[PDB]
Write a protein that binds this ligand. Structure first.
Ligand SMILES: Nc1ncnc2c1ncn2[C@@H]1O[C@H](COP(=O)(O)OP(=O)(O)NP(=O)(O)O)[C@@H](O)[C@H]1O
Ligand SMILES: Nc1ncnc2c1ncn2[C@@H]1O[C@H](COP(=O)(O)OP(=O)(O)NP(=O)(O)O)[C@@H](O)[C@H]1O
Lengths: 872, 872
């Protein structure tokens, strides 16, 4: 059946068939707009391809060519024809937006003859070859593997030798020449083979390699970053060209109907006099401000002006738009919802709602939950900024205060950042090839490329400062240095940028905390209103507490209690207990902890103010609390009066093949019910008084880690209660208090109906359940983990994102089961997953009471709650 | 309800309710044997009791005393009266036969007063008073907690002060003496509270206790061994007492209806005049052969014999019977299927099946499959035994070559077997309390006790050797020595024990392999004829295939690949490989093993003779295939151009916190597919060659470990399928092969449906699965497991008995979801749960094509796969 569609034959509501591109392309057409005519091979073909074993069925290929013919007819020219040839572009696009990640080829169907036809038919040879070097360039770079630098340097070395600065300055001589060299590049790079002369070769060649784009390395990166199933595929758009390389009254631009950094109303973008779209999107040549095209083409801009506010309305959201003017005749190639900063993200929403185009529901919904992390990135200290040593100033591509140490590629910057380093990456061009870098880096500095460049839209997206098109940079790539201002910067040296001023700095500038702005707060009342999951916070100190509470969090979900045991005033008391041979001896020494931890629990409860807290009883194994240093073993052995060969014997004894799975947690509490009881008293006595002290009521939750058998937790909770019951009788407190569990071990989940006979609550630590379920531990894992992403085996970080398909089955089962035995059972999530919005939604969906996250993630959790509800 | 049944009110089928010892007194009473009329309070009382916060209800209490009144009427004696009292036995016997794991009290209904009325009645004060110190004893111990260490000394402090060598020798006044001191002993520990003289209060206090028995520490251990469920509890019996301790015409005993060790046919059992059963039973005295009762009183002999033969006949099973002569009269007290050894248990069945009394089927179902482990126990080297310095000798109460270092208490013995010693237990007596020892002991040596004893029997069932009743020995528990014939021995001294002669040996006698009787071989036939499961083995070498094979093993279910690097001529290569700077350096270093490994398979392929083999690829992390010593480290560097700095650089890096959850197994081939190829080559080449030579058909199974994702196994599998077809092209081979996957990560059995699409078989490596379903290690589970069993947290050992409840869930789910996409899907299990009968059944029942257990456990799988085929 139909593998090929015509723009007119389609609409925005046909996105899964033709992409966001051909579905807005079609849409733009059906809007009557000046959109160059073409067709789309649907994402079904892409699929057929991989199952046609990276090939095109005789059927799907005839439809392509059959459709091409159709374009000829309409245009009045034949494909890659000899004299008056039809010229096409071969564009990609997935179901979703992944700016500059996949590839596109331009001017497809110029052979060795047609360029002469072309030259003569347009009476413009400068133009013909520019478009032909451009074909061999793009085509060979993408269809084959021949990299840009080659073409980038050749097109370089030649303007040098020729003593020219701009592309617009090469003669048709140099371009025909360059044409020759570009095919030399090709014929070379591929042991003999010469550049495909038949457009039916060119055409099929592109379509295929654009399907292939789907799995570019960089594409697999953007997809993980944004939870995109690597299986969707991409459609290939075949669109009849419109040429901007045709002179002064011709040229190419891209724009956002509103600011994508600031959020501000009114056009934003760039344009490039006499140029094809690539140079601009592809961060290859630095273009000028859009105000130019306004000034020096007051008409084509007024037209563009209208059509932009059309599309804004038609789509009811701020749009990024690709366009070309060919000889004073403006053309719209693309439109989409611009990827923006979170600060921007929010401003627009409030705006559109305020104006009246979108509701308060549509707002909360569209916002990319994760970008909220940006809103708490530290900004510069004014005085420090005002004293930093300016060395230069380029484009404010992406906002942010980025102080770091320079690397000249991505893989390195990433590694430097994955060491502990704060990295600033420095690059010739603004590229989506460097996405591994841009993400790693605190900041990005480039010599060329504009804010409209792909990378930029995407950098504004992730939350990476950018400063682009700094043509005053020299990059010394053998030396691994670069020159700007007066100096030369060595790899590792501190530069600092400001994606807001644009001004660049030698050195490393101070950063203070950041302010949370208005619209943020407006947005925050809506989610808060539409959501039904409560947002907790993983937090172990009153201070961590105040921070989350300030952001707008409702309780502590996980409050870990291992630091109460670690600290100088602490670590002795516990160390004593471990070396105690008598049980009373162990009791006795832990006891000397009680005034300490109770004073902790009071400091917390004070900060807490009646919000719930799930306190986490002692997690890890004793050997985490013993001295592995002989210095502190001998000291210890005197502190009590033993031979160092007993304390050394104890550790040795407590030591473990696998720490992840020792006599730890609930298995510990069992053999040493004493620690259980001790923490019971502190919590209770701290709770009771701080209620008696503040008047605000408290209902302690007590959480037991690493359970997996009902009878196990049974034994343990029986202890706690007694202690809670006595502390009560003593004090004479009627105080409600809950005892529940961590569901972190599968069997705990698998038997959730047994466990629930005991657990008053369930707390899901998928951090730990994901280790157990997967079989790898967080740490040692990294060893394969990246080799996995690049290979498409895990399309998400199981420790960063709750693996619903597997780990998730357990999460649900433990709910469906736990609640069957106890229907009014509360459940929470508290991992790192507790703040990933995929995890957050899913948790709203399998029936959670709450999610808990890091203080500074509470708002990702709150908006991610807002949307989990509305979307169901 | 009817919480109480007269003996006449019951039968065989009321076993779960009357308990075992219930349905037997009922059964036997109906057949009308000389059973002393008593009555049975039901096992449901046990439950009601427990449930009732461990108290007795009014109705139960009422139901008891009412029969106590019926009990009087027949006896013509008002219970525990003063002039002519009614004296009862309060006995315990669960629905399961846990010999002497349970308490029972003799002679309840006696006190200072009633004792006197008895001696006036019975006109025999030495007896009258003996039985009041007995009841005083057996009560103080069971209901309270006073130890036999005490009582058994004041008794000896009397047989020394009164200068007698026997208990018989003691005048009624020593007993008037021995009696009170006992009460002195009792009160001492009861806070100034004395013995109860309440024929009523004594009863309730006694019952309560007998119900409490079910959770007896020995019991619990015994319930962990024979898989008895921990919720069944115990029924309780109050029976009229007859008297073996009256005179020279009275006496007690017990006798098997066949040799319970060697299965020999005919009567076997001992006897003791002038004592109540407990003497023989508790292994507190040494009895004489029943040959004795044959000369003394041959009517009672001949009475007894007949009923033993009628008893076997009625139960179609070698009975274990208890009798007590009260003055020329005989009285049957007890009966049960006679716990035997694996030897005997095969014997009888074949005999019973011959004779014409049990079906071929039956023969199978009722052989404790797990016992066949004794079967392969090594036999004392005959030449080395002909040398053996025999020092003394006694009752061969249980068979076997027991050899190892001696300890004086159960725990000293067990704690020695933890470290890994081969221990021999040395005891005053054979007692059912010394169990942790009987389990960990290679055999046991007691000064006093019979072959018809409690512990004795439990020794035989376990397959544990026991030489009992060696009057010679003198234990010096202080110094921890014993003086026997030759010399005095020290805690740890090596000796051996021929349990088949009860001949002792000074020294650690050399041992050797053992064979299997034609009786085993006969049963093995009846196994296969009846089982649905196939059975393979965990085998790495031709020696161990050949071994497995001949035991019944069909093919191999799990061949490990590790030694192929472990080994001498192998390790340099993987060591050469790890340190390889290039993939090229790898492949190079790698291909050098192919020759080594290739034969290592051609080897196994002439050994399987067509039997299928499951080949696990490499599993561990590289840090295992390196020198973990710093001397070790440098020596390899000198051999490959490097230095300590370069070696440690690796050996350091290769380090993981938890290597169980490490970059290992399937995750290795992801980043180093060079091995997968290498391994695929070593196998594929060897297969055909051998297939082509012998002319036997060979179809390789290949199994990838630590798979938890579908895409994950295909990548490794794709690597495999290329090398495989590359060899097949080379050799012009059509050799089909199968690529399956272990299932040992929980995320695989979860997503079974996805996995089976790529994997041609599931193989259940139950062991890491357990370790991960439980969230803990086995190498590390010593430190709490003990608590857990003792505390009843865990009933069974999760690393030996397949956990049907939790882990079993994933298994089913795996075979379900798995077979939903590959109907033909073969799945087998290779754990240590592949030689556990209980585990095997669940496997049978769910649909595992086969089971695979270690070569020396194949006869257990066989029988068990046979039993479970039937019993389902
Ligand atoms: N038929 C065409 N005629 C003239 N210019 C075109 C044509 N098709 C695409 N372009 C331009 O060439 C550049 C590349 O096309 P495009 O398919 O949008 O890829 P991209 O913009 O680089 N990445 P993305 O926008 O996310 O798909 C853009 O500037 C387009 O506007
Ligand atoms: N009413 C009785 N009269 C005489 N002897 C009795 C009586 N009741 C029990 N006995 C004997 O006392 C001894 C112990 O009692 P018993 O209830 O059988 O526990 P056990 O044999 O020691 N262990 P178990 O076999 O598991 O129940 C046995 O030797 C009995 O034969």
């Amino acid at each position: 059946a139909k593998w090929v569609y015509k723009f007119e034959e389609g609409n925005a509501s046909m996105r899964n068939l033709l992409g966001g591109k051909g579905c807005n392309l079609a849409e733009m057409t059906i809007l009557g707009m000046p959109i160059p005519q073409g067709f789309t091979v649907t994402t079904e073909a892409c699929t057929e391809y991989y199952n046609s074993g990276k090939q095109i069925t005789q059927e799907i290929q005839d439809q392509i060519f059959e459709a091409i013919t159709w374009l000829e007819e309409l245009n009045g020219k034949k494909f890659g024809d000899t004299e008056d040839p039809l010229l096409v572009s071969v564009r990609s696009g997935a179901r979703a937006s992944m700016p500059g990640m996949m590839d596109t080829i331009l001017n497809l169907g110029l052979n060795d003859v047609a360029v002469e036809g072309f030259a003569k038919k347009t009476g413009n040879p400068r133009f013909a070859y520019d478009s032909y070097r451009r074909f061999i360039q793009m085509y060979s770079d993408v269809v084959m593997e021949v990299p840009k630098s080659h073409f980038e340097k050749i097109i370089d070395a030649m303007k040098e030798e020729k003593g020219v600065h701009f592309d617009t300055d090469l003669t048709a001589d140099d371009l025909k020449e360059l044409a020759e060299k570009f095919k030399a590049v090709y014929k070379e790079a591929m042991n003999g083979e010469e550049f495909p002369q038949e457009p039916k070769d060119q055409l099929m060649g592109a379509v295929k390699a654009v399907f292939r784009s789907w799995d570019n390395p960089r594409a697999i990166v953007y997809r993980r970053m944004n939870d995109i199933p690597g299986d969707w595929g991409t459609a290939v758009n075949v669109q009849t060209m419109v040429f901007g390389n045709k002179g002064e009254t011709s040229g190419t631009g891209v724009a956002f109907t509103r600011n994508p950094s600031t959020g501000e109303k009114g056009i934003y973008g760039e344009y490039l006099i006499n140029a094809q779209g690539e140079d601009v999107v592809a961060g290859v040549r630095t273009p000028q401000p859009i105000t130019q095209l306004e000034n020096d083409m007051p008409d084509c801009y007024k037209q563009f002006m209208d059509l932009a506010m059309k599309l804004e309305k038609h789509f009811r959201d701020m749009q990024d738009m690709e366009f070309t003017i060919e000889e004073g005749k403006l053309y719209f190639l693309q439109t989409r919802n611009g990827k923006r900063t979170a600060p921007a993200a929010l401003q627009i929403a409030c705006d559109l709602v305020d104006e009246g185009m979108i509701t308060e529901e549509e707002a909360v919904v569209r916002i990319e939950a994760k970008s909220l992390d940006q809103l708490l990135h530290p900004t510069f200290n004014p005085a420090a900024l005002k004293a930093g040593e300016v060395i230069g100033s380029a484009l404010p591509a992406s906002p942010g205060a980025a102080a770091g140490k320079v690397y000249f590629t991505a893989d390195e910057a990433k590694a430097a950042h994955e060491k502990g380093e704060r990295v600033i990456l420095v690059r010739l061009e603004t590229s989506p090839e460097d996405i591994e870098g841009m993400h790693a880096a605190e900041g990005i500095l480039t010599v060329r490329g504009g804010m409209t460049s792909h990378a930029a839209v995407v950098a504004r997206g992730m939350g990476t400062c950018c400063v682009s098109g700094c043509g005053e940079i020299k990059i010394n790539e053998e030396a691994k240095t670069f020159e700007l201002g007066g100096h030369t910067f060595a790899e590792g040296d501190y530069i600092s940028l400001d994606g807001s001023t644009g001004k660049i700095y030698k050195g490393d500038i101070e950063t203070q905390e950041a302010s949370v702005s208005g619209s943020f707060e407006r947005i925050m009342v809506w989610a808060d209103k539409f959501r039904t999951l409560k947002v907790r916070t993983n937090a172990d100190t009153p201070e961590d507490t105040l921070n989350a509470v300030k952001l707008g969090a409702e309780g502590i979900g996980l409050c870990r209690t291992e630091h109460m045991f670690f600290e100088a005033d602490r670590i002795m008391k516990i160390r004593k207990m471990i070396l105690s041979d008598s049980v009373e001896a162990r009791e006795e020494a832990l006891n000397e902890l009680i005034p300490f931890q109770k004073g902790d629990f009071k400091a917390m409860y004070k900060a807490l103010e009646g919000r719930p807290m799930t306190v986490r009883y002692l997690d890890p194994p004793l050997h985490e609390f013993v001295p592995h240093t002989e210095e502190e073993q001998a000291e210890l052995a005197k502190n009590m009066g033993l031979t160092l060969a007993e304390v050394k014997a104890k550790v040795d004894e407590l030591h473990e093949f696998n720490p992840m799975m020792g006599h730890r947690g609930c298995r510990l509490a069992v053999t040493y019910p004493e620690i259980a009881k001790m923490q019971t008293r502190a919590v209770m006595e701290a709770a009771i008084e701080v209620k008696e002290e503040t008047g605000i009521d408290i209902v302690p939750e007590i959480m037991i880690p690493l359970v997996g058998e009902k009878k196990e937790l049974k034994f343990v909770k029986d202890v706690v209660v007694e202690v809670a019951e006595q502390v009560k009788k003593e004090k004479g407190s009627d105080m409600q208090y809950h005892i529940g569990t961590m569901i972190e071990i599968p069997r705990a989940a698998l038997t959730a109906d047994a466990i629930a006979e005991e657990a008053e609550f369930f707390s899901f630590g998928t951090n730990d359940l994901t280790q157990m379920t997967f079989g790898f531990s967080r740490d040692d894992a990294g060893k394969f983990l990246d080799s996995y992403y690049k290979a498409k085996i895990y399309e998400s970080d199981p420790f960063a994102r709750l693996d619903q398909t597997g780990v998730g089955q357990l999460v649900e089962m433990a709910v469906k089961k736990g609640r069957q035995t106890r229907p009014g059972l509360k459940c929470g999530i508290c991992g790192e997953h507790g703040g990933d919005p995929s995890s957050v939604e899913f948790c709203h969906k399998v029936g959670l009471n709450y999610v808990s996250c890091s203080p500074f993630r509470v708002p990702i959790a709150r908006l991610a709650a807002a949307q989990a509800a509305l979307n169901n």
